[PDB]
């Protein structure tokens, strides 16, 4: 989890 | 009022639209796995696209039933005797982790009329071997332990073996489930492929997922369920923090009003580096900062980031992808107040959902 | 009712007796650092031995003041403008992390009449793991000598440092010597010095005599009141977490599913990581049956550890984890919707009192 | 860290 965060 | 989480309905809807595409193209059903995201102010919206929720235990089941409705599913490695009766009232599908668990509760399940399932461990590891298929896993029934003579009353089979993965490892895992458990699939009413499907990550092979789901439903005459958690709320929330102080000690240090240890614990535990709007890596922009929490903890360091202009007291810092695996597991260590929870509506207005205070910290301690 | 924490007054008192020895032999004062242990049902007992509490923020300061009384100290890396007034109403000693913080709040502090201090960073690392060491380079905690402003000390009555964790007296003596070498010219004018926490005072073998000698020498040389603010030492080996086995299964070995979760109920077990002691439990291969103990969560990684036992674990077996009072209840969570463990107090007379039992509302209210 | 000295 948390591998694909984006602004 | 910072620190605060902000969940954006438009970004939730972008994810939900994709999940609804999968439903409409296959006739499958999709449930929210609440362990990732349990912000029930958003449950009616989510329920207008999805078919219901799944749960890890009684509390998630009650929340899904009462705040979303639809279908309410549950799985637990081991149910408590003092909760099974309420679970069977709330839930329409109940998944057991072992044949001992199934036989213990079978009589109550049959009397309740709810639909019973078993979790399978296909022993097909596609992660890093946190992997539910690793040797010695306590999750699901392996083929060697499978009891076809005890399947009277079982209407479904379930597996959950993925995390942030594309369609190909699902297709591969389904093939192994067919190889190992094939003879017992036809008699089921439903199959549940679990979560970990990165369906809303750009580039996910939706077509491969649709083809796999459709083939299985057709071959075995079953209703397939998917139960994503992360995919529902991926990149749909933020954590907003204000800089409280900036000091110099072998570089620029900023003390924020949010704590990683308290408010985004996976940042330290995993560890991982959360995205900051306008933030870059060290040396990428004009100013490097080490961002730390307002706690007394030497280790509560959020990370090293660069910015084009200085951070100063009163500067706002926006962390991204903060809806998932955050509010569901935060804490009041050091007595830090919990961040407020806001909802940005699709019309652009912002609503305060929940604000916390002293009593929320105190009541946990005696 | 399992899972549940049980804190034992007799074991708390064993620790408090040692801390009171230090007070009586030196004339120092000792505060509970609440971040380790904030079980306020025990605050009256603790306050009958100790001088009060210290706090990491407003909420701990309010809890200490309202539930223990005595002296109420506070330190924060940065105070919130919207809390400083209430903090000053509650606290008698207030420690600032930087000269910018001190100058921002100095006028309010003087008007309040409370006693202001500054946290020093002596830049003398003695901890094994640099990530946890407040003296490591780039630390945000305390003022380093190169940043110290002797011209801005008007109104400062104390100096504070906190640099240790689970350490004996020698690292404190060594750190005090560095503080004297770097900050010596400004110690005499202070009313108090605070040596922080991390002093393993109640661990068997701790060199109490060396601590006593150091505290006494500093108090005499500079004419100051010394404070110590241990957290862990107050509640070390004074609490338990009791769990019931829910199911046992076989998959390349024996597995027991417990009704307690490491991820939810003892998160440091997974995060540090470390292996908690279990009464009657041994290491792998040491007793007749090896088990991997896992939680009742949907988390593959919620594995408490591998332990051996002389007899089988069965559904209904009770497993007792030890040293569970510290850094546990203060930071637990409701991930996966697991109910929080109940909190019990085993009284000096052997009776057991239910202090707090949790339920659905405690999980739900955190989410919207 | 903070759990070095637990005992039965
Ligand atoms: K069928
Ligand atoms: K003095």
Numbering used by the authors:
A (entry chain D): 2 to 8
B (entry chain A): 9 to 137, 140 to 376
C (entry chain B): 9 to 376
D (entry chain C): 1 to 8
Sentences from the paper on this structure:
The polyamine known as spermidine is typically made by spermidine synthase, but in many bacterial species, including 70% of human gut microbes, carboxyspermidine decarboxylase (CASDC) performs the terminal step in the production of spermidine. Carboxyspermidine dehydrogenase is the first enzyme in the pathway and uses NADPH to perform a reductive condensation of aspartate semialdehyde and putrescine (1,4-diaminobutane) to produce carboxyspermi­dine. Carboxyspermidine decarboxylase (CASDC) is a pyridoxal 5′-phosphate (PLP)-dependent enzyme that removes the carboxylate of carboxyspermidine to produce spermidine. CASDC is a homodimer, with each monomer composed of two domains: a β/α-barrel pyridoxal 5′-phosphate-binding domain that forms most of the active site and a β-barrel domain that extends the dimeric interface and contributes to the active site of the opposing monomer.
Electron density corresponding to PLP was observed in the active site of both monomers of ClCASDC. Electron density for two conformations of Cys306 was visible. The sulfhydryl group faces away from PLP with 70% occupancy (both chains), placing the sulfur in a position in which it is unable to hydrogen-bond to any surrounding residues. This shift alters the ability of the carbonyl oxygen to donate electrons to the pyridoxamine oxygen and Schiff-base nitrogen, which may be important to facilitate the expected proton transfer during the catalytic cycle. ClCASDC was purified using a N-terminal hexahistidine affinity tag, and electron density for eight residues of this tag was resolved during refinement. The tags appear to originate from the N-terminus of the same monomer, but the linker density is weak and could not be modelled, so the histidine tags were designated chains C and D in the PDB file.
